[PDB]
């Protein structure tokens, strides 16, 4: 029901600026001046930092600013500071007393060099197929920041069910890793041309594809 | 200033739990604009109540919201494991302000033990073509969320090259993790087999895979 799209992540080093977007439709974002932005440090209560597109509540520094053009609102955070590292969400009203939220953007203040993920996609192992399971696994390692989005395709169609992705965890080399897995039945696996795992990190996407084989 | 919520609340499966949200005459007690949100750790939240008592579409009627004076309450009946989460309240006040409480972590006590499903995968053709032979041991559907992993090369302990991720809770309310062993193709092809041994609650599950015959 929400139409609000936010990029999954953004990053900068201390003292840089970052702008993040919140795209809706004419009936929500573009239909009034009612966009809000909220900051949440993980595991703590969120806070309203912008209301009515551009207004800061008391105590929010003027490094945070909000604007809008058409059906896209934008939050800019100049002068990045360590405390800015957080998840940011938008909202907008959208007709018939409805409030709509974006999916959130994780903003990292870079604490180490950026590292793109190594992505390995594994087809079903012989043992699990003999157990009537065709789970595929997409291994994603050695990445920084530790924010990664994963999507799967059956052929070219988005896969809407049976997907799980672990929360990225910092490994012994101090880069993050995670796994996404898609719990297919053998029929599903053998009857499609292929399945693909798409990993998005720092706004660039990598795709890996596998297909059934006989042995 | 925050609204006041207890930091913790708990209940057993099927039982009920009530949590409160105490504000002031100019926020919670000033109008009917109290909302509640649910949030699983590491996930986006979900609005479960608005305007004190109203459920958005898709919210079960086991969640109920009320207010008396300056204190709003949320009651979750028929507790289920998927209800184990953090719960925040909010209430618009004057001057375009929006106040939030500090969050209550609701724990659903006594969730059942569950042993891991372990699937070991051998190196993919693509990665072998790129001169890599990482193996992955997928570990899912377990509870509670602590496992240890050891790897074997033939029968011998593997002391290097192992990473295991920190278990995270998944949509079925049980944990998952992967352990991955970064072999060279030469290490992979020179052994009879590799094994992934997963220990959970004193019990071990071992899987073994060997270089393919095709
Ligand atoms: C997501 C969400 C956020 C939140 N907050 C965040 C602000 C808040 C005040 C907060 C923050 C922290 C802790 C506590 C509270 C309220 C409430 C909420 O209820 N939620 C779910 C509903 N809304 C969305 O999840 N939108 C999503 C993307 N979105 C879509 N965007 C475009 C097209 N789409 C087609 N299908 C889906 C989408 C998926």
For residue B124, report the distance from its CA to the centre of ligand 1, in Å.
37
Task: Produce one character per residue of A111-129: b if its CB has 16 or more CB atoms within 10 Å, e if not.
Answer: eeeebebbbbbbbbbeebb
Structural domain includes residue B87: yes
> Are the C-beta atoms of A189 and A134 separated by less than 8 Å?
yes
Q: How many residues does chain B have?
A: 214
Q: Are residues B139 and B203 in the same domain?
A: yes
Q: Are residues B26 and B84 in the same domain?
A: yes
Q: Are residues A91 and A157 in the same domain?
A: no
| B121 to A125: CB separation less than 8 angstroms, yes or no | yes
Q: Are residues B95 and B125 in the same domain?
A: no
What CATH number has the domain bearing residue B91? 2.60.40.10
Mapped onto helix, strand or coil, the DSSP state of residue B146 is coil
> Are the C-beta atoms of A173 and A138 separated by less than 8 Å?
no
Pocket test for ligand 1, best of B3, B34, B37, B92 (most atoms within 8 A of CB): B37
Boundary (domain end) residue, out of A54, A79, A109: A109
β-strands A136-143, A118-122: how paired? Answer: antiparallel
Pocket test for ligand 1, best of A72, A86, A100, A103 (most atoms within 8 A of CB): A103
Task: Produce one character per residue of A184-210: b if its CB has 16 or more CB atoms within 10 Å, e if not.
Answer: bebeebeeeeebbbbbbbbeeeeebeb
Q: How far apart are CA B56 and CA B43, in angstroms?
A: 19
DSSP chain A: ----B--SEEEE-TT--EEEEEE--TTTGGGSS--EEEEE-TTS--EEEEBTTTBPPTT--TTEEEEEETTEEEEEE-S--GGG-EEEEEEEE-SSS-EEE---EEEEE-SS--BPPEEEEE---HHHHHTT---EEEEEEEEBSS--EEEEEETTEEP-SSEEEPPPEE-TTS-EEEEEEE---HHHHHTSS-EEEEEEETTEEEEEEE-----
Q: Are residues B92 and B61 in the same domain?
A: yes
Q: How far apart are CA B181 and CA B161, in angstroms?
A: 5
Structural domain includes residue B16: yes
Boundary (domain end) residue, out of A109, A143, A158: A109
For residue A91, report the distance from its CA to the centre of ligand 1, in Å.
8
Q: Are residues A17 and A105 in the same domain?
A: yes
- The resolution, in Å, is 1.8
Q: Are residues A104 and A158 in the same domain?
A: no
Q: How far apart are CA A204 and CA A95, in angstroms?
A: 34
Dihedral in degrees, nearest 10, Cα atoms B47, B53, B55, B59: 80
Structural domain includes residue A3: no
| B96 to A121: CB separation less than 8 angstroms, yes or no | no
Q: Answer yes or no: is the C-beta of B57 below 6 A from any ligand 1 atom.
A: no
Structural domain includes residue B162: yes
Q: Are residues B128 and B103 in the same domain?
A: no
Contacts of A177 in chain B (CB under 8 A): 163, 165, 178, 180
Q: Are residues B101 and B24 in the same domain?
A: yes
DSSP B31-96: SS-EEEEEE-TTS--EEEEBTTTBPPTT--TTEEEEEETTEEEEEE-S--GGG-EEEEEEEE-STT
Q: Are residues B123 and B104 in the same domain?
A: no
Structural domain includes residue B133: yes
Structural domain includes residue B168: yes
Task: Name the domain count of chain B.
Answer: 2
> Are the C-beta atoms of B114 and B205 separated by less than 8 Å?
no
Please count the residue pairs, one from chain A and one from chain B, whose beta carbons lie less than 8 angstroms apart: 110
Q: How far apart are CA B12 and CA A161, in angstroms?
A: 29
Write out the residues of chain B at the interface with chain A, using a CB-CB cutoff of 8 A.
2, 41-42, 44, 47, 50, 57, 86, 88, 96-98, 100-103, 119-122, 124, 126-127, 132, 134, 136, 138, 140, 163, 165-168, 170-171, 176-178, 180, 207, 209, 212-214
Structural domain includes residue A184: yes
Q: Answer yes or no: is the C-beta of A2 below 6 A from any ligand 1 atom.
A: yes
Q: Are residues B12 and B89 in the same domain?
A: yes
Minimal-distance CA residue of chain B relative to A100: B47
Domain residues for the domain of B76 are 8-108
Kindly give the number of the ligand 1 atom that is closest to the alpha carbon of B98. Answer: 9
Boundary (domain end) residue, out of A79, A109, A139: A109
Q: How far apart are CA A116 and CA B76, in angstroms?
A: 42
Q: Which residues contact A161 (CB under 8 A, 6 or more apart)?
A: none
- Tokens 């071992």 sit at which residue? B206
Q: How was this structure determined?
A: X-ray
For residue B48, report the distance from its CA to the centre of ligand 1, in Å.
11
Structural domain includes residue A87: yes
- State the first-to-last Cα distance of chain B, in angstroms, to the nearest integer: 67
Q: How far apart are CA B35 and CA B21, in angstroms?
A: 10
Q: Are residues B128 and B98 in the same domain?
A: no
- The structure tokens listed for B78 are 């028929």
- The structure tokens listed for B80 are 């289920």
């Amino acid at each position: 029901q929400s139409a609000l799209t936010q990029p999954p992540s953004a990053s900068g080093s201390p003292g840089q600026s970052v702008t993040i977007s919140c795209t809706g439709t004419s009936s929500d974002v573009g239909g009034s001046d009612s966009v809000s932005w909220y900051q949440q440090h993980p595991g703590k209560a969120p806070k309203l930092i912008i209301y009515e597109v551009s207004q800061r509540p008391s105590g929010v520094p003027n490094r945070f600013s909000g604007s809008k053009s058409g059906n896209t609102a934008s939050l800019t955070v100049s002068g990045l500071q360590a405390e800015d590292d957080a998840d940011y969400y938008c909202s907008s009203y959208g007709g018939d007393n409805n409030l709509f939220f974006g999916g959130g953007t994780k903003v990292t203040v870079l604490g180490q060099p950026k590292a793109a993920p190594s992505v390995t996609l594994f087809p079903p192992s012989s043992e699990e197929l003999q157990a009537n399971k065709a789970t595929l696994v997409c291994l994603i390692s050695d990445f920084y920041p530790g924010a990664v989005t994963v999507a799967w395709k059956a052929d070219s169609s988005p896969v809407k069910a049976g997907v799980e992705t672990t929360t990225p965890s910092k490994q012994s080399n101090n880069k993050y890793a995670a796994s996404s897995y898609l719990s297919l039945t053998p029929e599903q696996w053998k009857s499609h041309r292929s399945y693909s795992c798409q990993v998005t990190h720092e706004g660039s996407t990598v795709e890996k594809t596998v297909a059934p084989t006989e042995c």
